[PDB]
Amino acid sequence: RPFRFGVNLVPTPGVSSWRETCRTAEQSGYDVIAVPDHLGVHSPFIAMMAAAAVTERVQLTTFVLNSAFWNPVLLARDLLTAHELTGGRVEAGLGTGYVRAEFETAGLDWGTAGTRVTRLADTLAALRTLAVPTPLMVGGNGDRVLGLAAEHADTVSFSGATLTPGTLRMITAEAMDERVAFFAERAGERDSQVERNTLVQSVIATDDRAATAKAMRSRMPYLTAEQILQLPTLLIGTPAQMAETLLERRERFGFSYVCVQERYLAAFAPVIGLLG
């Protein structure tokens, strides 16, 4: 599938640069602006509308909603509105949620891993029954979550890290091979209709990839330097090397929808220039 590039921007209360940041993303060649769903961050659909008002080309996506924060019928109303009032520019990524303190602050039941995944399942089923027009993305690497992506999603987002719900660890390329294969087996005949996304956490410009990876073992001691050089959540080297890496990873994993974090917006833009 043709590449599409996203930048995960954090609309921040008290910071007056939202419109300028969204314009920079579009001017830098990104195809998607992605926004998160967290307490203490601006409300995602309202921020996406504010982005739509100052951009013309980019798609706007939630990346990803905390399913515990949304009533499915009311979310369906939001999605239809966002779709119609932007001219079809909105996509909705969904997840189970994972920050327990935020559930507690909002007065919501943390429950169990099972109830949190079931809430995502129930929401996805409802959104499809209500025939929402926004493309749907599902994010997360748990078995049940990838099964839901395979059943319901237009895009599956493969995480690239794990944590203990209630600390972050990057997964290896080999673990990622297995998660993509699991998804594909669950998707069956629908595999070819689901776009594959991943989020790159760090985009590290360097003229010495090997020395950089060796140094980075300090922050990820559970990995070798060779594993660090193959980690799907990291891009290391020159822009030409990073472009070649993304071509190789599209072949290996099927990743054609690549997002980066806001801090690396400018660092990654040269790669967009080379892949287009």
Ligand X SMILES: C[C@H](OP(=O)(O)OC[C@@H](O)[C@@H](O)[C@@H](O)Cn1c2nc(=O)[nH]c(=O)c-2cc2ccc(O)cc21)C(=O)N[C@@H](CCC(=O)N[C@@H](CCC(=O)O)C(=O)O)C(=O)O
Task: Give the interface with ligand X as residue ranges (CB under 6 A).
Answer: 36-38, 63-64, 66, 95-98, 113, 139-142, 145, 157, 159, 162-166, 199
Amino acid at 222: Y
Q: Distance (Å, rounded) from C-alpha 110 to C-alpha 117?
A: 11
Compare residues 157 and 212 and give the one whose CB is closer to ligand X.
157
Closest approach of ligand X to the CB of residue 230, in Å: 19
**Cα separations (Å) of 74 from 81, 103, 130?**
11, 19, 11
Instruction: Return the residue nearest ligand X (CB atom).
Output: 95
Answer for the pair 79, 133: CB distance below 8 angstroms, yes or no: yes
Q: Report whether 192 contacts 154 (CB < 8 A).
A: no
E strands along 96-232, which residues? Answer: 136-139, 155-158, 161-162, 169-170, 195-200, 202-205
Q: Could you tell me the two tokens for 263? A: 């801090």
Question: From the CB of 133, what's the least distance to ligand X, in Å?
Answer: 22
Q: Which is nearer to ligand X, 59 or 66 (CB)?
A: 66
CB of 183 to ligand X, least distance (A): 12
State which residue, 164 or 193, has the beta carbon closest to ligand X: 164
Q: Cβ closer to ligand X: 3 or 98?
A: 98
CB of 129 to ligand X, least distance (A): 21
Q: Is 255 exposed, middle or buried (0-12, 13-18, 19+ CB in 10 A)?
A: buried
Task: Tell the smallest beta-carbon distance from residue 145 to ligand X (Å).
Answer: 4
Nearer residue to ligand X within complex by CB, 55 or 67: 67
